[PDB]
Design a protein around this ligand. Structure first.
Ligand code: HEM
Ligand code: HEM
Ligand SMILES: Cc1cc(N)nc(C[C@@H]2CNC[C@@H]2OCCNCC(F)(F)c2ccccc2)c1
Ligand SMILES: Cc1cc(N)nc(C[C@@H]2CNC[C@@H]2OCCNCC(F)(F)c2ccccc2)c1
Ligand SMILES: C[C@H](O)[C@H](O)[C@H]1CNc2nc(N)[nH]c(=O)c2N1
Ligand SMILES: C[C@H](O)[C@H](O)[C@H]1CNc2nc(N)[nH]c(=O)c2N1
Ligand SMILES: [Zn+2]
Lengths: 411, 409
């Protein structure tokens, strides 16, 4: 079967065949679409088909499908599963697997970059201190003094689910949030719960607006341990505006390295519960979401006050005007400090070229429109006008619940 | 089977039970989501369960479910379908059905208004000339000198499908588009094909940038005929900016009355193929889509130039800056001329309030996030942060293909 998608701006029609390789469920049915819902141990039995499907994909990718090496590896993995109940990936397979999880990540607008990914194999890690060292090296490598390089660090896979490696932080670098007795929040309101956990675990909180959180690291199912990232490894950018000299005195800054650390990487049926990965920012992540969400730093009012906008009616579009200036400021600040960043126009235009290439060479590109369209100026980006098909391919990144909800405290 | 939707800004969680009454298919499956795809006669046998499902909901709405009058009407409609192959709605049922088609319109952000809809029953209409009169009266009533009022006009239902009433136009009021001898497009590029059909049917085109198209009306399955809406019934607004004196020199205008005329209204299995309806604009429709879509009036570049912005690099956000100014100018111009308009902040706030009402009083609210979130400033409106379930309830409005594909002349 063939599914078609149309671009309503160009009339370009693309044909998807890749969706035929999708196995997992979307949340949608013939009767209900869950496209805007954020959240819509294996037996030997379920594991070998998953392993075989992956190894088949891997061996096809290297043009060795059906070779003796391919058949030998199937046999090897089969024997390993029957005897030890799991199996280990070759380094080559792990690299291919991590690259493909990114390539398959339907919510990721940055996927033109997918084949350029530095994979740090941390499967020999055994302790939280060991995890800390690996994560420091990842941060330093990926940061590269502002010339950011995409990377992922992969810690040992799940075994019985009682020995999980987990990074408790949702991102390697984030700022603390402190709920005040008067109900106001200091710093990032998104990180209040996690900040409270770190404090409980013994973190001495500076209690300012931009305190870099410590890492909370769980190795081998043990209780998590606290570590502070060396400050000299945390590259930050003070935010200023090219025309407005008062913008700097808002006191804003942000970190240069966006690094997701709470997702689960599935490759060949194996589950990597700790697999922090990083790229570089699209400006709107910071200027639209982190700064302007009512739920986050919420700076729109203060910015519009300083611009002397007419704020007595929403129809002056004061929020929209202030929003644009804040995003100009973020991009300008990053560019001026020589820290990699991409604007939403550039990123979406590159995504469309990536997606067309994928349709030609792969027969599709699963994409989640709700996430791919930027949170400002949607329809002046080419992705707004592009029909997309969302489906789930493996290898994959999956959301997993926060560890504090499920962790068995050892004491 | 009982489903939750969470607002990620406020943490409010609502439980949807209404989706279990949903009937039609979405285009999605367990393997593939088609949420971003724009486009994802009845026999006696198919018609009666549709009639019954509708009449049950109707009698329930007026708290007379299972009453003698409920059973009597079901009986009456059954007899009528068996004997005549179709049936006629009572005026009360027609009004109820049209209001609920709007209530069920998952792509409509303006549904807080759904119960205030003026329904014009045009089922007695028999000719294209009659259609034109009804439409002028709708246009005049809905416009109301700029104080717009929501309205729908409902022409006769489909019979054997060879006698369809259709308005060939996609909206009652739209501007012509013409392909120019040097490859550019004058007017609205979206209307080039329809304008050619108008000219070849007789229309004398003025060949300007903002020529209101004539209506092409089809009655009783006949070949459509051309009528010009009286110019004095088409309220238009010159676009100016409150700060930029030069903005007026772009020579932009838009019409005040948005009136969708190409959809099919289904009520109780009955199909109203000509049912033009109108409300009032949300400003982004005009300022973001009509003016700034690359395939539409495409004015971003000219505005940005007049603002003297750095157009050399995307990262200066010149497109974004010009976009906001164009939308400020649309809203200002409508407001100054006392023509109803709503900004995207205000409209989305109202929709969230509407969703909460629908959840508490009805068990849910079908909504299509891809359409409901405005085409600019998505995440600074509250709908961006609201999970929505999309599902199809009847009575409904459905898109139908342009009739010039269907029509045999
Ligand atoms: C190279 C530059 C990259 C850019 C500009 C980029 C951009 C983005 C953006 C804007 C999002 C949506 C983020 C949000 O709204 O929270 C996203 C999501 C995502 N990205 Fe990329 N990304 C990049 C690199 C990467 C890399 C290296 C990986 C993994 C190897 C990756 C995997 C993902 C995944 C799994 C999601 C969904 C995240 C979630 O569900 O929370 N991205 N990306
Ligand atoms: C009274 C003020 C109204 C407002 C502010 C409003 C707002 C909107 C907007 C912004 C859209 C998306 C339009 C687009 O992007 O093309 C829409 C779609 C829609 N509206 Fe409403 N509307 C109003 C009245 C009505 C009425 C009176 C009806 C029916 C009686 C209605 C039914 C629909 C339908 C069926 C759609 C989807 C249209 C399509 O598929 O092309 N609306 N509305
Ligand atoms: C509920 C839920 C589900 C889910 N899948 N995901 C989340 C994290 C949310 C998504 N939206 C804001 C926040 O994500 C925060 C992290 N944003 C991505 C990034 F900046 F870290 C990044 C890393 C690497 C490359 C580019 C960018 C929550
Ligand atoms: C392909 C396709 C499918 C579909 N269902 N619909 C369309 C009309 C498109 C949608 N998006 C732009 C254009 O719609 C143009 C009409 N816009 C709505 C309105 F302005 F007429 C209006 C009426 C009443 C109240 C408020 C506003 C195309
Ligand atoms: C409810 C809705 O799905 C939710 O707010 C989504 C919308 N789109 C998004 N898109 C991106 N890139 N990141 C997000 O966090 C969200 N949030
Ligand atoms: C491909 C995508 O579905 C298409 O561009 C949609 C996106 N959201 C929209 N939303 C509204 N209100 N109107 C539209 O025409 C569209 N177009
Ligand atoms: Zn879906």
């Amino acid at each position: 079967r063939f599914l078609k998608v149309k671009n309503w701006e160009t009339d370009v029609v693309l044909t998807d065949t890749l969706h035929l390789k999708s196995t997992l469920e979307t949340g949608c049915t013939e009767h209900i679409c869950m496209g805007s819902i954020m959240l819509p141990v294996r037996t030997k039995d379920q594991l070998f088909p998953l392993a075989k499907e992956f190894l088949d994909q891997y061996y096809s990718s290297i043009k060795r499908f059906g070779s003796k090496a391919h058949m030998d590896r199937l046999e090897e993995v089969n024997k390993e599963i029957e005897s030890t109940s799991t199996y280990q990936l070759k380094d080559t397979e792990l690299i291919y697997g991590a690259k493909h999880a990114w390539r398959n990540a339907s919510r990721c607008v940055g996927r033109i970059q997918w084949s350029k990914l530095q994979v740090f194999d941390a499967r020999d890690c055994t302790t939280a201190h060991g995890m800390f060292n690996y994560i420091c090296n990842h941060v330093k490598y990926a940061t590269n003094k502002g010339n950011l390089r995409s990377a992922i660090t992969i810690f040992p896979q799940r075994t019985d689910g009682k020995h999980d490696f987990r990074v408790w932080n949702s991102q390697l670098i984030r700022y603390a949030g402190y709920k005040q007795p008067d109900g106001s929040t200091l710093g990032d309101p998104a990180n209040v719960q996690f900040t409270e956990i770190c404090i409980q675990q013994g973190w001495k909180a500076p209690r300012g607006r931009f305190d870099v959180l410590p890492l909370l690291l769980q190795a081998n199912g043990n209780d998590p341990e606290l570590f502070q990232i060396p400050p000299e490894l945390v590259l930050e950018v003070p935010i200023r505006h090219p025309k407005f000299d008062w913008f700097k005195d808002l006191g804003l800054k942000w970190y240069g390295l966006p690094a997701v650390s709470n997702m689960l990487l599935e490759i060949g049926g194996l589950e990597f519960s700790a697999c922090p990965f990083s790229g570089w920012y699209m400006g709107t992540e910071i200027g639209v979401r982190d700064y302007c969400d009512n739920s986050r730093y919420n700076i729109l009012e203060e910015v519009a006050k300083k611009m002397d906008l007419d704020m007595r009616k929403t129809s002056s579009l004061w929020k929209d005007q202030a929003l644009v200036e804040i995003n100009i400021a973020v991009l300008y600040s990053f560019q001026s400090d020589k820290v990699t960043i991409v604007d939403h126009h550039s990123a979406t235009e590159s995504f469309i070229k990536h997606m067309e290439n994928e349709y030609r060479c792969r027969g599709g590109c699963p994409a989640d429109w709700v996430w791919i369209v930027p949170p400002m100026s949607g329809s002046i980006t080419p992705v707004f006008h592009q029909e997309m098909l969302n489906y789930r391919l493996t290898p994959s990144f999956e959301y997993q619940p926060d560890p504090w909800n499920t962790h068995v405290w050892k004491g």
